[PDB]
């Protein structure tokens, strides 16, 4: 017994307190951070990312994350890539009916179903058909750390 001290060997629910729907961008960043134990609240993330209440852009999000030492990259991946090496909590850009733009946190994509954590919703799982309809493109992939595998 005690072969390996698995850090966070259990899945938990990150209870992020929502304020406004524009906070969604900061709430996403918060969700991933707190998921790995990093105490970064969407409130503090809002002032960190320079959250614009008319257009919270991914440009500010990624830079502020990296200011925390939390490495992030803004990449473009297609639906086919979702079935490749997608195993990240990630801030993806979705636009509903070309009207309302929000960020959703991707957890994993399996059986053509994309498991997302929408800051405005609970835990919703969209099929490729549903997801690609609103998801134009744009994923801010987040690194849980640099050499965080070590201890």
């Amino acid at each position: 017994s005690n072969a390996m001290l698995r850090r966070l060997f259990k899945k938990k629910y990150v209870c992020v307190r929502q304020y406004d729907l524009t906070d969604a961008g900061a709430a996403c960043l918060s969700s991933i951070a707190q998921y790995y134990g990093l105490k970064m609240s969407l409130a503090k993330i809002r002032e960190m990312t320079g959250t614009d209440t008319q257009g919270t852009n991914a440009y500010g999000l990624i830079h502020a994350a990296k200011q925390l030492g939390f490495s992030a990259k803004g990449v473009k991946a297609s639906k086919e890539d979702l079935l490749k090496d997608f195993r990240l909590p990630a801030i993806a850009n979705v636009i509903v009916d070309n009207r309302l733009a929000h960020f959703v946190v991707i957890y994993s994509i399996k059986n053509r179903i994309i498991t997302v954590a929408d800051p405005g919703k609970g835990i919703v799982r969209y099929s490729m058909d549903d997801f690609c309809s609103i998801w134009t493109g744009g994923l801010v992939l987040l690194e849980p750390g640099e050499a965080f595998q070590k201890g």
Binding site: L21, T22, D23, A24, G25, C28, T51, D52, T53, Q54, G55, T56, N57, A58, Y59, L61, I62, K73, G74, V75, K76, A77, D81, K84, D85, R87, L88, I91, N93, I95, N98, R99, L100, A101, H102, F103, G138, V140, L141, E143
Partner: peptide, 24 residues
Amino acid sequence: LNIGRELTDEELMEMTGGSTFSIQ
């Protein structure tokens, strides 16, 4: 994770999570 390289800033400026499109 390394999926690829990051794109131009304009792509990130285009990406938004609290914005509204089709302004009309």
